[PDB]
Amino acid sequence: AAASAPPAPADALPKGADSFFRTVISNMEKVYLSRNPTAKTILELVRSYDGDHICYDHFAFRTFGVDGYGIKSLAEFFTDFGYVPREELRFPAKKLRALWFSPPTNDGYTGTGVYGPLPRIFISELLVDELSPQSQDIIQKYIRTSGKGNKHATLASTSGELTWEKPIYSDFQVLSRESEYAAWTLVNGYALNHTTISTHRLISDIRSINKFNKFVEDNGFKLNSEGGILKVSPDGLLQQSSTVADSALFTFADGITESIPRSYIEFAERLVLPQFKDLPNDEVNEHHRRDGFEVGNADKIFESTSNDQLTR
Numbered sequence: 001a002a003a004s005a006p007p008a009p010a011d012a013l014p015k016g017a018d019s020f021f022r023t024v025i026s027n028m029e030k031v032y033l034s035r036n037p038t039a040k041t042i043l044e045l046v047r048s049y050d051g052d053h054i055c056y057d058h059f060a061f062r063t064f065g066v067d068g069y070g071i072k073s074l075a076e077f078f079t080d081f082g083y084v085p086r087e088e089l090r091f092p093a094k095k096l097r098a099l100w101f102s103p104p105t106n107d108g109y110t111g112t113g114v115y116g117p118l119p120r121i122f123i124s125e126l127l128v129d130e131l132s133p134q135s136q137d138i139i140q141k142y143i144r145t146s147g148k149g150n151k152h153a154t155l156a157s158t159s160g161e162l163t164w165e166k167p168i169y170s171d172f173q174v175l176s177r178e179s180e181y182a183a184w185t186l187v188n189g190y191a192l193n194h195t196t197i198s199t200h201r202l203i204s205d206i207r208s209i210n211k212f213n214k215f216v217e218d219n220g221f222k223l224n225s226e227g228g229i230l231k232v233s234p235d236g237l238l239q240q241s242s243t244v245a246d247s248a249l250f251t252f253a254d255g256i257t258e259s260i261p262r263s264y265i266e267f268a269e270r271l272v273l274p275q276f277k278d279l280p281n282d283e284v285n286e287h288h289r290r291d292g293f294e295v296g297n298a299d300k301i302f303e304s305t306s307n308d309q310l311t312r
């Protein structure tokens with residue numbers, strides 16, 4: 001038989017870097033919770049129902065793929081803190097590309113949320129050069145107003161700031177008609193687009209995602225309907241659901257106040273891999289479960305912020 005070996009575990013961070021990294025993602029989460037009452041409420045409801053067991057499966061971010069404002073503007077922060085780039089996903093109809101990142105080894109975490117197992121990171125970018133000339137010019141205008149803001153995307157994310165000037169409503173309107181993703185990013189920037197609860201790490205009966213979905217719906221919240229409320233990967237091992245994004249009033253730079261999408265929250269179940277079929281269920285750890293993401297699922301979860309879902 002050919003020589004075989006297990007995968008090399010990723011390096012762990014030194015103690016200061018690990019601590020510091022967690023204060024940063026904690027600040028990203030603070031902005032997110034302050035602007036997304038639905039996500040904040042659901043996280044409180046799960047904690048009360050299940051106990052202190054909430055783990056974050058992944059964080060997701062959106063970006064403009066032009067002039068260095070894209071995936072790389074955030075990825076460098078995470079790779080400075082030991083994250084490893086993984087698979088690239090393509091979304092041709094929506095004109096998006098995404099990369100996900102797996103965390104450094106962190107087996108000694110002592111808490112939950114950002115103090116629990118470190119989350120994967122999912123970062124997408126809009127392929128701006130594929131849009132109409134008019135939208136390319138609108139995006140380029142804001143990118144010019146931002147200067148070297150792209151070199152400090154994490155500062156922007158931790159503080160809840162846009163690096164470009166505040167948009168005028170007319171520009172938001174034009175982008176909304178061609179790319180809802182572009183419109184989302186114009187008004188939200190590098191803000192955390194969602195966190196994800198790892199349901200299989202819960203202890204109570206809502207650890208099953210079908211039970212979890214009914215728990216959310218019975219507390220009055222609406223799940224993303226597109227492609228069904230439960231997106232199931234073709235191998236059956238990655239099952240995902242998400243809320244409809246919250247909305248907020250935004251005063252645009254020309255004085256007009258209008259509704260915009262903020263963020264949402266996702267729930268994900270990763271099932272055991274087939275080679276570990278007969279593992280006793282008390283023996284399953286995260287590395288025994290389906291890792292990564294699935295283009296089919298992701299394509300429909302992007303629509304949690306779409307106007308059709310928000311106006312259902």
Ligand SMILES: O=C(O)CCCC(=O)C(=O)O
Pocket residue numbers: 060061062122124193240266293294297298299301302303
């Ligand atoms: O809406 C976004 O920005 C990311 C949607 C994709 C995703 O997070 C997943 O596949 O779980």
Ligand code: NI
Pocket residue numbers: 058060122194196266301
């Ligand atoms: Ni997600």
